[PDB]
Design a protein around this ligand. Sequence first.
Ligand SMILES: [Mg+2]
Ligand SMILES: [Mg+2]
Length: 132
Amino acid sequence: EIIWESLSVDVGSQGNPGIVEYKGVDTKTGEVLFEREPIPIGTNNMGEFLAIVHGLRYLKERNSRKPIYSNSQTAIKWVKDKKAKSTLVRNEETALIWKLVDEAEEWLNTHTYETPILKWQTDKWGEIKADY
RNA sequence: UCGACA
DNA sequence: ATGTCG
Ligand SMILES: [Mg+2]
Ligand SMILES: [Mg+2]
């Protein structure tokens, strides 16, 4: 039932809102495929959203049909909607993450993909493989 | 009034 | 504790 031939993504933070990073790993091997440099201020859900969209772009660039696992129901909805409905304040500290979010939404509105975005079933399978 | 994803 | 949706 775990689709091993997949990319798993996860966010990591220090505080929330606080410093956010994310990474994508091969679900089978645990090899780290991408890891975003820490963003100074962001939310968990923004980060989880950026991680999925980063995965889509990564797989589309590489002509891969693998699905993406996320454990974030929110992020999965935001990607489906092409809209990150975050209520993080806008200021000079949050301008970088909000610009990345806006750019990700714009990517979603300008590209197609068939990548299935699947919910990692933590209750049954343990932590997602990209966890921090 | 919670419940749930983390 | 906090960000989010059902
Ligand atoms: Mg996650
Ligand atoms: Mg995690």
